[PDB]
Amino acid sequence: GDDRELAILATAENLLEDRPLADISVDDLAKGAGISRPTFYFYFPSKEAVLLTLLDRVVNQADMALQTLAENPADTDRENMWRTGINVFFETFGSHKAVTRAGQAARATSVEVAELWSTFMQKWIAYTAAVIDAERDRGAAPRTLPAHELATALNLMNERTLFASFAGEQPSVPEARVLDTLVHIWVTSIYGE
Amino acid sequence: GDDRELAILATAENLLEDRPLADISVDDLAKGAGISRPTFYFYFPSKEAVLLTLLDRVVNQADMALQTLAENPADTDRENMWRTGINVFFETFGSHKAVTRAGQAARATSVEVAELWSTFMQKWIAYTAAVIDAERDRGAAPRTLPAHELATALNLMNERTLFASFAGEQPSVPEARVLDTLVHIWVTSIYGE
Numbered sequence A, B: 001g002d003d004r005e006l007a008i009l010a011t012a013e014n015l016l017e018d019r020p021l022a023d024i025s026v027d028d029l030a031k032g033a034g035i036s037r038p039t040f041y042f043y044f045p046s047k048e049a050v051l052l053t054l055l056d057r058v059v060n061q062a063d064m065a066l067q068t069l070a071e072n073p074a075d076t077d078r079e080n081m082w083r084t085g086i087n088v089f090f091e092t093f094g095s096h097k098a099v100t101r102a103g104q105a106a107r108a109t110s111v112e113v114a115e116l117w118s119t120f121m122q123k124w125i126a127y128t129a130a131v132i133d134a135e136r137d138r139g140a141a142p143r144t145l146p147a148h149e150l151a152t153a154l155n156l157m158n159e160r161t162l163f164a165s166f167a168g169e170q171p172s173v174p175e176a177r178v179l180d181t182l183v184h185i186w187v188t189s190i191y192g193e
Ligand SMILES: O=C(CCc1ccoc1)N1CCCC1
Pocket: A066, A085, A086, A089, A121, A124, A125, A127, A128, A155, A158, A159, A162
């Protein structure tokens, strides 16, 4: 049921810690979840569909966490308010680096992974632009760039920079410095004249 | 000679306008360059090596243009000095979008394409950090983030945002707004307290 399904998802997330989706067979997932290969196909149509569900859960987990923040404003200054929002992504994706890495690789080959990512990026950018506009309306931020274009560049910077950090790419910001680095660039570009 | 070699490179850059490297065969490049398939193999070991050379030429072209700028400072204010530097990348990669797109796709599968990209990204980030430090030493920019970490995030933002613009990704900044968008974020984050 949701038991064999969860077992399959947990197995795939464990195996993805060690090798790419290419080195993982349906037999590996089935054996890890303690079921046969034809039984696997009753829960998922392919190993690609397993990754899509894992990605969908992590993305939604990030999106729900940001919604919670939105509904429960922290009582602190502006720089800290941005930091707690960026942190949702740093901690949610940073707690699932194997899925994040595999999902990024699948954007190239999977229309559904590309559309899921694109849909949520559009939503986070529109939320970011809405916050910038509210700040501009209250006179706390200057009318500089179009808010939506500024939001789009800053969300793409975060996608790329967090991802480089979590993958240990050359070049990357160390993971223990990446939150501070991004918050500085967001605050200075949103509030700077 | 350099004639048959150039013909092969021009053919591959033309074909890459229309389809991915996967849909292009060695026979396609040979026929386009007016030579046989075994003759092709005398100039390049594979279609992947053709892409690597095209990428190497565009990268070096960008790097030499930035060096020229470095050696011949423009007589203008700071925001314009950053704009002319970012522009080197916007115009060089923007004039070769098919190669840029294919080269980005090959980073996943080619160690040599990944190393070429990584080597030049490290050089541009180190140059960027050196400029920020000079500005800090002369008292024109505040000592906020570590210069090299700030440089790394801004160069990764440019890589990702320019690339999204040139590929017409969803989401992306329109190509006619992307230079202005990036220059704002660089200037406010480098000079903002
Ligand atoms: O940091 C963000 C968004 C940060 C943020 C803060 C408020 O709204 C979005 N992203 C990383 C991957 C995709 C987007």
